[PDB]
Ligand binder design. Sequence first.
Ligand SMILES: O=CCc1ccccc1
Ligand SMILES: O=CCc1ccccc1
Ligand SMILES: [Cu+2]
Ligand SMILES: [Cu+2]
Ligand code: NA
Ligand code: NA
Ligand code: NA
Ligand code: NA
Lengths: 620, 620
Amino acid sequence: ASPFRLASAGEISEVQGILRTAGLLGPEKRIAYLGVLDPARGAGSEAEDRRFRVFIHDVSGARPQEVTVSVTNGTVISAVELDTAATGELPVLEEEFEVVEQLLATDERWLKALAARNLDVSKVRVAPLSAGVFEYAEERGRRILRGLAFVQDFPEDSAWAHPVDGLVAYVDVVSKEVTRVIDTGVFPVPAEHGNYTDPELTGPLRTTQKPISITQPEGPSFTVTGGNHIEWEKWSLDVGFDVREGVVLHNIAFRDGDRLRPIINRASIAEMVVPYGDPSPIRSWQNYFDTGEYLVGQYANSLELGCDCLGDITYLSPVISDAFGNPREIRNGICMHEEDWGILAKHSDLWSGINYTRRNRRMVISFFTTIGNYDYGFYWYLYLDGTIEFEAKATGVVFTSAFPEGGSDNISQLAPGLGAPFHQHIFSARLDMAIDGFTNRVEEEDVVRQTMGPGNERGNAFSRKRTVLTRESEAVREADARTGRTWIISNPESKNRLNEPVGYKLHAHNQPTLLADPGSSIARRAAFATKDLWVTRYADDERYPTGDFVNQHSGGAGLPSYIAQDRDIDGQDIVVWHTFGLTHFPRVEDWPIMPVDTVGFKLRPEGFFDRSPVLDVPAN
Amino acid sequence: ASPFRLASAGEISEVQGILRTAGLLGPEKRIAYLGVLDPARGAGSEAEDRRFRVFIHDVSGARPQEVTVSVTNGTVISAVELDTAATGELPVLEEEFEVVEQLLATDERWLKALAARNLDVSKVRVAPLSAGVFEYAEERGRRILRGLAFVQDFPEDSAWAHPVDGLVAYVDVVSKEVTRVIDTGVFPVPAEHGNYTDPELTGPLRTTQKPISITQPEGPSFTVTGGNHIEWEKWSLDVGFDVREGVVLHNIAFRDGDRLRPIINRASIAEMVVPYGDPSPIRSWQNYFDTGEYLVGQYANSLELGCDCLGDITYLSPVISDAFGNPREIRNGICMHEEDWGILAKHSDLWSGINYTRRNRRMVISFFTTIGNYDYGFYWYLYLDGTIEFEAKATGVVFTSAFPEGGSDNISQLAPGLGAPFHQHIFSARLDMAIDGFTNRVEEEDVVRQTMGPGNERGNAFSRKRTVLTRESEAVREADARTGRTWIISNPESKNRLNEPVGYKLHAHNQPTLLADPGSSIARRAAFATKDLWVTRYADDERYPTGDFVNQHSGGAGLPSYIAQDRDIDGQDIVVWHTFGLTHFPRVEDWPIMPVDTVGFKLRPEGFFDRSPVLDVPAN
Ligand SMILES: O=CCc1ccccc1
Ligand SMILES: O=CCc1ccccc1
Ligand SMILES: [Cu+2]
Ligand SMILES: [Cu+2]
Ligand code: NA
Ligand code: NA
Ligand code: NA
Ligand code: NA
């Protein structure tokens, strides 16, 4: 019944049939993206219409198409041919991952480079890296991937330990031509292996860890209805899944007494970018948008009970399309469980004699994705007290290079001859806000220091100030940790019992934003990453901070184009875009496989409730 | 055997006997502090000498004394009479908590103030607040407490809901005189109760929470020997307890292969301060040092299994002295347990076919203290991967006032007529470092942005810089979140296999430091709180960032006095002092009892190991 239910295998099969019948899915066609569209604003009409958006690539060189279909009515709503030199190329296809290595293996220039290094071509893996846009005029409007080489000594070897530095190739994957092979000189291929399951490297495994058993003898406290509707400890929401964004949260609301109170209409990680800070021409082009260019949702892992998710786990298995429109299940792709979270509130009172302790808990919704060397866990958390938190967990294997003789200012050494270039991991959270409804506004809150003097004779006073952001042109904001800067999303037409607007406060981690020079190609294509906070007026087609077609787009699409409309955001239907990231100078302890590091943000109620919302939590 | 074992009841009884026999513990004497001294540097002599430091107060007006005794030899080592106008008053005594209310109850000025407000004196509780040092010349060298009044409607009522604003009294607790009663006008006493166990306020308790069962069927993975020596997953350390500081960690080391490698010699929270930002003369003097003035360790709670600590818990019950030198056990005052901590490392490799997942865990050492309205949990965490983290959890009841008609810039409204003044909670962690031994140094690490140009033609490069702090006069440092500033403690004489100095990196939360005007009394007495990081040369007598006698000390003691010695800290025995805190603008959801908020810091290895230290963790 619910318009926010997960896509079914039958829906995807119908999309395939509709596309085929319309002549849109011949043997040269590939589906590069397929996803269900959200209901438009004002769906109080009970007009069930499940629509899907599709990007269709053509492997023969014909122009790709963007298509919208209605599975409910079985019709093509619209179909548009794309000029990719103008609006950007389509996302990378999984089946192209191997084409770069295959094409290079028969190119005489590539072969001469490997021969000089005495590398057997059958042992050389080539990473299929997105190209970006730089100085090469012949790449405009062509579908280009760039290749960096790694040696695998045997089939189970970790190739990342053996980078082939000084060598890069560019490939046109549609015409199947190697456009350029650049060899800047021979570097020794690092010889130590990085096989973290080899007993030679691990030593004997610890025998000292005793088991931790986490069980729920009466089952979990949350309920799942209609496939993906969650109710837990007054929270209510729908868990969506999109092949580009991954897990998406819809309709986050909190039952406060008799009223279901909305908080967030849609929450997602709408983009992420990993820019590299090595000026070597072998890697100075390297910036990959895992979300926008590769689609992190299609690489979600199947999560193992006891290993990836521990406790009383409820799984969702989302369905996606393969490149031919067949449905493919991601078995156990989403874990949901509740976790004990320590003390919630505690007081022992010297005058009343009352001793009081309550325990906290959180609801966890997570998935894990793998794109080449990197692996990321995406975690959404709901707490008893109304807090919402997001956490990204970065692990996997660092991207490697040679470590130059005589050192480097932009690479750290991990092992003899083995380097790891400096880089960042930057995310964009898109928060379609609905604090008690859609009439919302954003205020910037700074601590205010006061001078000793009249009215402050002992010099102890301090205060705060709030600035309302009223138009999009003034809603591009930077962090300021020193002044305790936060942002408050409030509803000016909904007041608490003290006659103050209800609100939620966004707490950032205040990590550095994009470091690249403002005139760089990556600063233009990832402009969202240069600022901590953006606020836009809601619009149906404004989905990603980088635009719809990120791959090889020349820049400026997305947020800098949206805010140029300078729309009213003071008590309106608004969207918050928060940039947050990790700056990674790799350490020896990150090698051969990296222990998890984390970054995120959280939102806490700020006069949303009339008092603490967890007074009715029992003593356990 | 171990010199770092907890104080025993027999040791304290011997101290009492030694003091009594020496004429130092007559009926007018009170022990205001008693604690075991750490071994001096270079204890490779096996010279067991358990020494205790004692502060002795005199309730008749005689000068107090500082005394050092040896329980091993049964002798007084030294005894010094204190001039408190010079060096500060002794910490507040528990038995003085009730003396302020008792003395005010017979003062005619206090009675007239209560009579005008129609308050029955038997219902009026008076909080015993530390005085600080302000403009009152007659307080110099006298033991002063200040009193703020709260009404209790019945014995089990929460008095915090009913502040009596406009009224403050100053009391000399030794001569038993009320020096001043200040009445600036009548405010309505807020009428709503704040009884968070009253069903009228809580409503019916939730029935929706199902149990979470955390068990260890084979017991915990750590061992406790000699009372307080912990070994867990290659970590080794001693858990101490001091009545001023609370839990103290000694001898933190990590077994790396065959070598036990030191990391931190002593870790503690050596001070905390709560400054209030309300300029009203009723409260503009209000700054309490829970650690330095009240001694947070003596108010540690007995922790309840299943409620405060959940899982397979091992308790310590530390012993302290009461005011007469009798030993008193704090039953179950420290919880120790290990916790699952999610994913540790994970990778699924497209070329090797290997799928790899390992789970993380942490060791938890915690205690909870209550001082009047506020309650704090102190948590130390050790992780599998070498990370050390501290976390403070703040809960309890916010300090209240009236909310003035017409609002306030320095107070938030919680309920009709009820306010909560702005304030901070600021902590000082004292880290006596020993990274691979005592030859340590500190470097400040900033991200370095680079300009597009020659050698950086695509404008993508970024780097980092490290600045060695060589003398104490240059080792007072501020946070800079925008440039990703961290601090590295390294050993220049101990290198990893890449011939780089081994190190640990301190990651701060970058919260605002002390907001008060630099010319204020609190800025002088809590000078440590004005800067994020201090580094000193180790010295036996340099224990607290505020000095030994914080109560009514006029300022400048502690860290600003230590660093004036301008000692060499470049490859020396050094101590890191990190200031971190919360800035609290109270929200409606903080009332009537506050959900936990947190702040802390962490240290991660930085080239300390030759590769990831958790390769030998098994697959579970
Ligand atoms: O994360 C996307 C870049 C990438 C893709 C495939 C292999 C290595 C790196
Ligand atoms: O936290 C120390 C200040 C204090 C002490 C006792 C009651 C209320 C407040
Ligand atoms: Cu990284
Ligand atoms: Cu507070
Ligand atoms: Na273009
Ligand atoms: Na909105
Ligand atoms: Na003095
Ligand atoms: Na030291």
